[PDB]
């Protein structure tokens, strides 16, 4: 399928408490592979996917120094935005960036992007065309004209169309062209009391990777989305994820309901019912 190289940047000021916190995290298809954190004892670019241990000490030395230079830019950004938004030097503020490219199965670019946020709100973004910016408020307007003047979009474009793409392919190499590691869900149903002529059937999907999954409850072929309770998918802490969906049903009609689990690791979706222990 498609593939992605994304970098997620965070700089957060903390007046009084010391210099801005600065973080760079890299992702190949949602999988974190490098990370920098300026609050570490020794601030360097560190491998986070063991397949990254393939790169030579130069790589790390040179991306570390890149992080340090980025930290300076964002630290100055923080100061600049206090001017733009007339904000106090004593408050805590956050800058975020998501930057990256998606290339196709053929290895061609399908989309370059770079998005900025300030205190959690969109600030400015590069358009589909890789040529123009979309500002979200008056302050971002000032940024947009400066960058248009400097032609920054042409320079970003070159990164996205080239550098980004080539390393994406390169990282895909090392981490295997389309690393679909896969643990299919182990599913089961539990049974729980309700205001007592009612019962709760809870369908569990456990130990699965990756996070994408779908559980449904069916009554005579129909999907009960109204009345289903769902939790957000969550990490077990060991690399896999968990989810459940529950349904409140009349006492004694448990066998009228079926749970369905859909996941790229499943040859065929799972079908299951409440089983009274034989």
């Amino acid at each position: 399928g498609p593939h992605s190289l994304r970098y997620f940047v965070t700089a957060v000021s903390r007046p009084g408490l010391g210099e801005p916190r600065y973080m760079e995290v890299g992702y190949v298809d949602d999988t974190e592979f490098v990370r920098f954190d300026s609050d570490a004892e020794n601030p360097r670019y560190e491998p986070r996917a063991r397949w990254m241990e393939q790169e030579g000490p130069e790589y790390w030395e040179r991306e570390t120094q890149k992080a340090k230079g980025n930290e300076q830019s964002f630290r100055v950004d923080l100061r600049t935005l206090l001017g733009y938004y007339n904000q106090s030097k004593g408050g805590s503020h956050t800058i975020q960036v998501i930057s990256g490219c998606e290339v196709g199965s053929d290895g061609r670019l399908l989309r370059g992007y770079q998005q900025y946020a300030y205190d959690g709100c969109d600030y400015i973004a590069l358009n589909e065309d890789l040529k123009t910016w979309t500002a979200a408020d008056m302050a971002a307007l000032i940024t947009k004209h400066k960058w248009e003047q400097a032609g920054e979009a042409e320079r970003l474009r070159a990164y996205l169309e080239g550098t980004c793409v080539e390393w994406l392919r390169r990282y895909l190499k090392n981490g295997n062209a389309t690393l679909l590691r896969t643990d299919s869900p182990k599913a089961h149903v539990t049974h729980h009391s309700r205001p007592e002529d009612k019962v709760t059937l809870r369908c569990w999907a456990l130990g699965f990777y990756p996070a994408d999954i779908t559980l449904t409850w069916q009554l005579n072929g129909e999907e009960l989305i109204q009345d289903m309770e769902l939790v957000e998918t969550r990490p077990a802490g060991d690399g896999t994820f968990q989810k459940w969906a529950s349904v409140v049903v009349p006492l004694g009609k448990e066998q009228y309901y079926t749970c369905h689990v859909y996941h790229q690791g499943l040859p065929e979706p799972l079908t299951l019912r409440w089983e009274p222990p034989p």
Partner: peptide, 8 residues
């Protein structure tokens, strides 16, 4: 690798 960022 990441982009070399300039200032806003």
């Amino acid at each position: 690798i990441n982009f070399d960022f300039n200032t806003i």
